[PDB]
Amino acid sequence: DDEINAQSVWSEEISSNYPLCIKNLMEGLKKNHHLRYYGRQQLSLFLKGIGLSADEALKFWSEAFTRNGNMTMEKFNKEYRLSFRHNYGLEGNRINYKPWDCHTILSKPRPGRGDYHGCPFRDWSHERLSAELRSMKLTQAQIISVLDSCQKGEYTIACTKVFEMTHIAHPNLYFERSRQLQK
Ligand code: SF4
Structure with a gap:
């Protein structure tokens, strides 16, 4: 827990290693x-993977869910805690919950209004991508080349270009490669 913990995943040092999908989920x-749901799974399983x-x-x-009085801790415990425990196997389930790779992410239903899961290189407009x-x-x-991809x-080539320019396709591989370059 020395490096990756509930507090350090909000630090700029750790989050500078996140690919755009994880950045988008953290911002939402x-x-x-x-x-x-889909964003809870994409993000929680990425974080388990790191x-x-x-x-x-x-x-x-x-x-994160109770911040700024958004919901009480009692509501979190009654309506969400079990789901996060399930993703970690803490209620005894033996389902595979591995982190989602890019192909898996792209194959999920596309995000609609209010959704933050998916792949920003596909799901964002060029103007939003350019601003980011x-x-x-x-x-x-650089931006023109990323947008061309x-x-x-x-999309995974666009993401690879962003990695190169700022330093199997998998958000956890982006994180690990970026974090190794800090060490
Ligand atoms: S290409 Fe993969 S890691 Fe990069 S933003 Fe899209 S889903 Fe995330």
Whole structure:
């Protein structure tokens, strides 16, 4: 828990390693104090995959959902705690819950209004993507190349370009490669 814990996953140091999908999920969670089902699964299983323990995951999700008075702890415990425990096997289930790879993410239902799951290289408009990439210090020529990949449907290549420019396709591989480059 020394490096990956409920508090450090909100740090800039750790979150600088997140791919765009995880950044988007963390932003929706930070702003709305909630995520709908597919986003809860995408994010919680990514965080389990980077080493967030069961106890630290319950801290993370309970604090995020009850922040700013969004819901009481009693409501969290009655309506969400079991679902997060289930994703960690803590009620004894033996289902496979491995982190989702990019193909799995892309194959989930596309996000609608109020959804943060999916792949931003597909799901965002070029103008939203461009603004995000500018905030990550990419230049116009870089952005044009990333958008070219997006328009061709090559979302994982777009994401690989972003990795290269800011330093099997899998968000956890993006994280691990980026985090290794901090060490
Ligand atoms: S390509 Fe994969 S890791 Fe990158 S933003 Fe899309 S789903 Fe996430």
